[PDB]
Amino acid sequence: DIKLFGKWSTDDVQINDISLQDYIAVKEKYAKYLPHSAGRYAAKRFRKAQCPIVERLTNSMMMHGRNNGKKLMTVRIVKHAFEIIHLLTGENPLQVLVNAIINSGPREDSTRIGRAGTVRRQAVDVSPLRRVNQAIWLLCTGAREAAFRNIKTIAECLADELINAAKGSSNSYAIKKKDELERVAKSNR
Amino acid sequence: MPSKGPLQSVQVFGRKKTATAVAHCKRGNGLIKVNGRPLEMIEPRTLQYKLLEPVLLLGKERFAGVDIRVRVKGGGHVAQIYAIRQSISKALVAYYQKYVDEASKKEIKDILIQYDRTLLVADPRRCESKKFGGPGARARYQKSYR
Amino acid sequence: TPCGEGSKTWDRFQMRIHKRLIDLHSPSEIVKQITSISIEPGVEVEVTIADA
Amino acid sequence: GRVRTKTVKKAARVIIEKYYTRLGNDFHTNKRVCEEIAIIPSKKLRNKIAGYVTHLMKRIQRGPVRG
Amino acid sequence: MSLVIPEKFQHILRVLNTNIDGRRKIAFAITAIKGVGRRYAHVVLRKADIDLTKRAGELTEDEVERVITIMQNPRQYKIPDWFLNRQKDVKDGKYSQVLANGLDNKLREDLERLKKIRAHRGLRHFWGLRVRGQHTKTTGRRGRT
Amino acid sequence: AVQISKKRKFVADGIFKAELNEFLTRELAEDGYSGVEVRVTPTRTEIIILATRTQNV
Amino acid sequence: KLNNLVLFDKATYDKLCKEVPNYKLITPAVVSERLKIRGSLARAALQELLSKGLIKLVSKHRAQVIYTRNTKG
Amino acid sequence: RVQPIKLARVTKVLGRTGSQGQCTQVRVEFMDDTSRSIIRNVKGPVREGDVLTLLESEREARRL
Amino acid sequence: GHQQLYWSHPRKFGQGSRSCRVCSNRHGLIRKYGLNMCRQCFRQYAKDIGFIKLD
Amino acid sequence: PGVTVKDVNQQEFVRALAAFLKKSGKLKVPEWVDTVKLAKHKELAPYDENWFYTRAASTARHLYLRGGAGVGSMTKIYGGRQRNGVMPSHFSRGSKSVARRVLQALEGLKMVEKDQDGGRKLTPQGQRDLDRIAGQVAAANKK
RNA sequence: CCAACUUCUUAGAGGGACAAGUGGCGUUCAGCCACCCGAGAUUGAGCAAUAACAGGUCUGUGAUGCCCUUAGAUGUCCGGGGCUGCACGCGCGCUACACUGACUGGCUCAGCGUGUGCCUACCCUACGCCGGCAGGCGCGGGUAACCCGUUGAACCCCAUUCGUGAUGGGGAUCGGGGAUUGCAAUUAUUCCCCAUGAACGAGGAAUUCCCAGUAAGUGCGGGUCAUAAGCUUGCGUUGAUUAAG
Ligand SMILES: [Mg+2]
Ligand SMILES: [Mg+2]
Secondary structure (H helix, E strand, O other): OOOHHHOOOOOOOOOOOHHHOOOOOOOHHHOOOOOOOOOOOOOOOOOOOOOOHHHHHHHOOOOOOOOOOOHHHHHHHHHHHHHHHHHHOOOOHHHHHHHHHHHHOOOOEEEOOOOOOOOOOEEEEEOOOHHHHHHHHHHHHHOOOOOOOOOOOHHHHHHHHHHHHHHOOOOOHHHHOHHHHHHHHHOOO | OOOOOOOOEEEEEEEEOOEEEEEEEEEOOOOOEEOOEEOOOOOOOOOOOOOOHHHHOOOOOOOOOEOOEEEEEOOOOOHHHHHHHHHHHHHHHHHHHHHOOHHHHHHHHOHHHHOOHHHOOOOOOOOOOOOOOOOOOOOOOOOOOO | OOOOOOOOOOOOOEOOOOOOOOOOOOOOOOHHHHHOOOOOOOOOOOOOOOOO | OOOOOHHHHHHHHHHHOOOHHHOOOOHHHHHHHHHHHOOOOOOOOHHHHHHHHHHHHHHHOOOOOOO | OOOOOOOOOOOEOOOOOOOOEOOOEHHHHHHHOOOOOHHHHHHHHHHOOOOOOOEHHHOOHHHHHHHHHHHHOHHHOOOOHHHOOEEOOOOOOOEEOOOOHHHHHHHHHHHHHHHHHOOHHHHHHHOOOOOOOOOOOOOOOOOOO | OOOOOHHHHHOHHHHHHHHHHHHHHHHHHHHOOOOEEEEOOOOOOEEEEOOOOOOOO | OOOOEOOOOHHHHHHHHHHOOOOOOEOHHHHHHHOOEOOOOHHHHHHHHHHHOOOEEOOOOOOOOOEEOOOOO | OOOOOOEEEEOOOOOEEOOOOOEEEOOEEOOOOOOOOOOOEEEOOOOOOOEEEOOOOOOOOOOO | OOHHHOOOOOOOOOOOOOOOOOOOOOOOOEOHHHOOEOHHHHHHHHHHHOOEOOO | OOOOOOOOOOOOHHHHHHHHHHHOOOOOOOOOOOOOOOOOOOOOOOOOOOHHHHHHHHHHHHHHHOOOEOHHHHHHHHOEEEOOOOOOOEEEOOOHHHHHHHHHHHHHOOOOEEOOOOOEEOOHHHHHHHOHHHHHHHHHHHO
């Protein structure tokens, strides 16, 4: 109805995990034309969940200082990367992102300050917003360290990892590394 | 030629950090431009949908009896397109409380409030000065001990 | 600080000076008694030349 | 951060002890009365005193407060 | 326009004493010459009336000769006088662009000249010191041992 | 001659005001000085002391 | 793990014009690593295939040019 | 041995824990009965009433 | 003396000629707005100048 | 209908107007045009070899929008950011004697005149034909 | 009067928000947590106690005790030199290690502020004409909401070229030249041009600042100033990831 970046309406997209229906904000109440809005989200907590994930995917993309406030420069990175996605697949690219949000967010990790077995010891669960935060952080990081010495564009290297993570193959960085979290959480489970 | 309906118009401003944009809008026939040039012909164009966004979810042919034109002063390239987005939203909102019923104004404010309230409320946050001990407003120079 | 020792403090003096401006089409002789209404130690008044 | 100082509470108690015949449970009316009937040096503690008065308005219509 | 390649393509050329790479393009291929910078190379080519987008191994030997001929004595091909290296040289009074081992000749000659008459610039060349008035209390460490 | 700007009008009279306050401290200290107060006019300008022992000045 | 080559041989150019207008995503960053050309030709040769009529243009951005296969059915 | 990866909704949050203020005790309910309810500890921001997914369900809570 | 070259070095441009009218120092003085007072010197009289702080 | 220049895409209006000035070979192009570097905050030559027409198209279009503009203000609109090597970068002015040579060039082309005060405006002969090719290139968006 | 008016701009006065309203919690005490209305439901800084420090500053001061020295003077002036000297170690900081880039050309946006002086010379600069560049002249304006200036700031944006290579990344080092300031530029003042093209591939232990227009990017203006900012103190621009423990 609102057609994020002018096309690809957000009616067909379906969030499969009930654990993340309150936290991924693709639906029509929180569906915009393009991911740019004056935020005001770290005034009070738990309103960064009704911030749309395309806004949170393009805010977590400007990272390493040299490209740090360049938000109109990363809003075209996501704009083309949906369009690379639709050519390799033929899916509404909002759906293949929200599969990668499910598939890359972990389920176990660990915390101790004391007598560190491997890194952290008491293996704890995860709240279902940190697994979204560590979904997009795992996607944006892994798309980035795999285009630092590469002829490949950061636009395609973004696209070619999250459809590689939405399918789930340990071939993207967001899948092959998240398993090391749950492995080492099993190693001190 | 002032022969019919003299000065049936409003002039409404909207603001961004270090910016303003006051939209003069008369009675007329579907004409919108910013500093002379049209709305689809604006400079950034990556943010093209969110300055013709009050056109989109309101309706072109429906609300084309008005001849909005905007002058913009101060700020920067992103703050001056949120300025005209806020302005011409609340320009024709302020135009309908004066020349038609507010039954239509509440009918169009109903769209523009469930859809991201900032179109006719001013974003209050501003520059927030630097202090005398750091390179920025909160940050400080690197403390050394040895 | 008078010296270099300290923890990098700074005092920011300022002086805000206001100024207002008023026109009259008066005959330029009675402006002398308009000046001579009061002494008023705070203000600084100046009358523009009568050659317009 | 809401919690009100000793001079707001003390000076508001001397109103309701003394001018209860003129006050009510509206903020904007009592804000005008305490302006007229006390000498408040500035506007912020004018309507910060008057807020505790109206808080004392619903409080004393129930029972024996320090009243 | 080369959809495949023409029949001859030099892997490396042979220019003055420097063998330039052939996969570069001519604006940036001849910059291996000590004396031909990134700036002087484009100016010679525009006076050579060549297309700047042509690659290096696909110039015929007339073009390679005409590029070498212009940069040997550019003072008559209307390249201006404060665009050259040796403006008003301190031994002969001429204006010349130097491009070869002769660049390093006139490079070192000024060192040993000042070292001969013992100017303060030449004494800091004879040692391992900085010339252009830098500090040395804290920098330039890994030149000396 | 030519007159100088309003920013440097207002630091000139203050450093006028600061200077004679420092001298009239040094003179009238034994006679109970306690300040001055100035009036600039486009005439005779009138400067008043605030001495306590006005008999001694 | 190092240098590729500019100015196509015959063995890549016929290999280009047989399968590079077939698959679904095609970009100068793709053929400068799927083939042994280095790029700058990936832009140059894939530009003139748009001139022939073998592929379609989508994006045409200064940082990213995106092509695809042509209409088959 | 092989357990279902079970989802479970939280009741009242039992405050922070974990010696840095990093873990929150939640007391989940297992979506099929509210009578079966184990106290567990998650990290990150919680929001009472939502649903989180256990990778393995019953091991241990905080008691010395 | 011998007045031809007693005071012969040109006190002109540069901090060999700027001085504090009030304190007679040449270091750190403030030549903004024609003050020409010593910076250490500036703090004393700044209330007498008419320079208030924030309050 | 009546289409002026303000409602046309003006990155490529310059691409239209420079293509007019090249085929209308009535421009006094200076003799040092190929060794220029264009305002010393940049370190290479201009890439396009006939850069003087797209400078003349650009310096005419701003002069349409800004009256009274001299060579001193034309250097404040073609300037950019000089990287100073190891020191912090700073803004620097444009080039004076290439902005002078283009305004004198348009004066022989009769599209600019001097003013009552300092600076230059354009004659009604000047605007009547860059609005003419403004209508062409707005039609060339469809064509 | 050959028009009116104050939305935008600059102020001045008064207004406005109080945890007030409404649920929930709480001894139904203080208050807390939620919301509605609202521009705003914690804007940011100043001042800032008692008692102290053998903290710093006698090289800031005609604030000052005591001592020392007082003419072959520790006074003062003048000429040169040094405070920049380098086998090394440390602390602030700039530029980077590139393709989310660098070029080249288009394109459009700021705010804070400062400007000709008693001594004390010298200011901000429009415009025109020479110069390929710094700059050089002629001619104006401004003691300033009067002029520079509608401060066409940079990043960003659009097209171009370059292709994972210590490469057009990076620009240290170094040679030759041209100009400006000055009594004087050598131990290079700065600036400009050509040429030269060094480490450097995200940095071990350790450690710093910060939680919203914040961090950070990016430029701009004060101070110093004859010449001058890699420093400082201010400004706007772009603008967040994390967190309410
Ligand atoms: Mg002293
Ligand atoms: Mg690379």
